[PDB]
Write a protein that binds this ligand. Structure first.
Ligand SMILES: C=CCN(C)Cc1nc([C@]2(O)CN[C@@H](c3nc(-c4ccc(C(F)(F)F)cc4)no3)C2)cs1
Length: 330
């Protein structure tokens, strides 16, 4: 089997991407943030504290003939930005772009933090990291991809995110019309539960390539590109007026600037992020200070190839027995 679904940015900055997901019988369609950096499928629901729901579409398990309480199971997760959610668990039928998993764990939120409440466009998250990160207790649950894997034509999914435009998540096949050139595959470590790999280096603008190993994760659920402070300083040094602002929380640059591109290495291949992809716009409405899309990973503890990086490529998440990541230009 295969599936294919369109993913759409939630706002004019590509802050996140939402993909429609069918849950239950009759189907309830919720727009979920597909997150290759976590492993929980959770939704706003009829159980979510009323004061914490503000415009989201909710999953109502009592209206699904295929929903079953997963008795005794609870979940609780926090994300790298400090947000969090928690609740109980149902199993139900879940379909993405025509691909169906029966008995998928659907984690129903009883509580969500303010950042989730405040984002009316995101109805939940669909985690696509390795199931070893799933937070359901006492019986850890599998991701949608892990459950679908055996049924897929090929044990892969692909992320083809758009720049200020819709994109595609495919499961079970590689769309050879969706990229240029060849896909370069690179080794994955699953030891931390992430799609963790090692980039071979970087270049800034038209500069020469610096060969240097950068361990990091491919994370569709993170907006920006987080790299070591040395790399990030070398990038922003090329932009007149750019500075790291403690009060804003990262590098800002004059909105009057044209940004250089940033290239990252995948083995012997190269992915070029256009400078425009690194512009996240005014720090506040009307400001002439703009927020940078390349930021330091110092104190995160891990480098993150988030959407800024991934949307410049066609990305293959190969979940074969020996997992790998593929990157192609597009
Ligand atoms: C070893 C150190 C790990 N440390 C915690 C840094 C990391 N962090 C992650 C993510 O937690 C998973 N991938 C990212 C993600 N963030 C979201 C999200 C968060 C908030 C909203 C809200 F604003 F609507 F609330 C929406 C989506 N979704 O995914 C972050 C992986 S590694």
């Amino acid at each position: 089997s295969t599936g294919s679904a369109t993913t759409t940015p939630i706002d004019s900055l590509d802050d996140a991407y939402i993909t429609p997901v069918q849950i239950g019988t009759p189907a309830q369609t919720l727009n979920l943030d597909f997150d290759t950096g976590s492993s929980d499928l959770w939704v706003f629901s009829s159980e979510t504290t009323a004061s914490e729901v503000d415009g989201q579409t909710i999953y109502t398990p009592s209206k699904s003939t295929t929903a079953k309480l997963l008795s005794g199971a609870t979940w609780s997760i926090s994300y790298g930005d400090g947000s969090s959610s928690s609740g109980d668990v149902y199993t139900d039928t879940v379909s993405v772009g025509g691909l169906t998993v029966t008995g998928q764990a659907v984690e129903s939120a009883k509580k969500v933090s303010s950042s989730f409440t405040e984002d009316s466009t995101i109805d939940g998250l669909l985690g696509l990291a390795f199931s070893t990160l799933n937070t359901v207790s006492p019986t850890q649950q599998k991701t949608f991809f892990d459950n679908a894997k055996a049924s897929l034509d090929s044990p892969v999914f692909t992320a083809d995110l758009g720049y200020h435009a819709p994109g595609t998540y495919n499961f079970g096949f590689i769309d050879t019309t969706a990229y240029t050139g060849s896909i370069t595959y690179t080794a994955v470590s699953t030891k931390q539960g992430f799609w963790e790999w090692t980039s071979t280096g970087y270049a800034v603008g038209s500069g020469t390539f610096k060969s240097t190993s950068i361990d990091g994760i491919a994370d569709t659920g993170t907006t920006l590109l987080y790299l070591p402070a040395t790399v990030v300083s070398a990038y922003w040094a090329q932009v007149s007026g750019a500075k790291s602002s403690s009060s804003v929380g990262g590098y800002v640059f004059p909105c009057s600037a044209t940004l250089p591109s940033f290239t990252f290495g995948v083995g012997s291949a190269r992915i070029v992020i256009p400078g425009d992809y690194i512009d996240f716009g005014p720090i506040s409405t009307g400001s002439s200070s703009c927020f940078g899309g390349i930021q330091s990973s110092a104190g995160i503890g891990i480098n993150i190839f988030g959407d800024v990086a991934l949307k410049a490529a066609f990305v293959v998440f190969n979940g074969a027995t020996t997992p790998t990541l593929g990157f192609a230009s597009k």
